[PDB]
């Protein structure tokens, strides 16, 4: 039963805060206690402020994220390379983690659309093509819609 | 150089229509010609109508999609098992494909949040934990925010 200074409480509360923070921005709910809720509120509004920092957004938009773990560790090391610490940097790091999540999804989306189109077009070719040809192709669907 | 009835035009136009349709719903732009644009418009509004069919939404929400390819082929076979064809079924199949895309992303999101939290908390533990302890843990961040 350690207090706030214990590493166990630090890792526990850290996970909670981070998850709440990331999930919040990804929704665009994680059960937490009152003081943790107060911190989550401050975090949320700072993330909002950073979302409006337009130079930062363009920078993050441009970094290529096919090896996102390399990117995360390189940015994290660089942010703290001068041997200084403050809470603003920790907040900033959390913000960066949430941006990586969103960046990662965005690279998944086209591949997912491609894979599923693959299934659908394969089914269409082997099972529907004959009937579609009898309609005179997709122009038959124009007729159907009354165009 | 085949017309609308050729299988080549059918597969080409089919991919275009499907991609436009899925991307449209995923955004929530794919270059196409005028008649293909007319079809895309009708498709879009039907998808809208199906999005409001609430029983269908609950049904699709409930199907488990960890093996989404099995699901797609089983639904597709079942939809056409009676040996009948019409354009409404083809539209409906396209709609289902777009719902699979969205369903697939939704199962990716938590795993992605987990992996990235993993990196961040690992970095925090090895590099920031000592300094955070000197602040008296996360309560130090409450102080920082002026709470």
């Amino acid at each position: 039963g350690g207090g706030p200074t214990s590493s166990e409480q630090i890792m526990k509360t850290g996970a909670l805060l981070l998850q709440g923070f990331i999930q919040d921005r990804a929704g665009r709910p994680v059960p937490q206690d009152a003081s943790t809720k107060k911190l989550s509120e401050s975090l949320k509004r700072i993330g909002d402020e950073l979302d409006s920092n337009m130079e930062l957004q363009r920078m993050i938009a441009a970094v290529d994220t096919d090896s996102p773990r390399e990117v995360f560790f390189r940015v994290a090391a660089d942010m703290f390379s001068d041997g200084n610490f403050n809470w603003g940097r920790v907040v900033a790091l959390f913000y960066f983690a949430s941006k990586l999540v969103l960046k990662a999804l965005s690279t998944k989306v086209p591949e997912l659309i491609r894979t599923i189109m693959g299934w659908t077009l394969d089914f269409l070719r082997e099972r529907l093509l004959g009937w579609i040809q009898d309609q005179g192709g997709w122009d038959g669907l124009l007729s159907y819609f009354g165009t | 150089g085949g017309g609308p009835t050729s299988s080549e035009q059918i597969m080409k136009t089919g991919a275009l229509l499907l991609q436009g349709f899925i991307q449209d719903r995923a955004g929530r732009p794919v270059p196409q010609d005028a008649s293909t644009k007319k079809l895309s418009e009708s498709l879009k509004r039907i998808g809208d109508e199906l999005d409001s069919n609430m029983e269908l939404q609950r049904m699709i929400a409930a199907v488990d999609t960890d093996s989404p390819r099995e699901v797609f082929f089983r639904v597709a076979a079942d939809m056409f098992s009676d040996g009948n064809f019409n354009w409404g079924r083809v539209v409906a199949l396209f709609y289902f494909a777009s719902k699979l895309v969205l369903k697939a992303l939704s199962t990716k999101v938590p795993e992605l949040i987990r992996t990235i939290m993993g990196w961040t908390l690992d970095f925090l533990r090895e590099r920031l934990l000592g300094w955070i302890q000197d602040q008296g843990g996360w309560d130090g961040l409450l102080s920082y925010f002026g709470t």
Partner: peptide, 30 residues
């Protein structure tokens, strides 16, 4: 590439700077 390494370094520097200047407000922020 070396052009990506510049962007990454840029991101890190901007984030460190953002963090360092959050001190200058009550409540902290931009």
């Amino acid at each position: 590439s070396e052009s990506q390494e510049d962007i990454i370094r840029n991101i890190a520097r901007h984030l460190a700077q953002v963090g360092d200047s959050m001190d200058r407000s009550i409540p902290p922020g931009l």
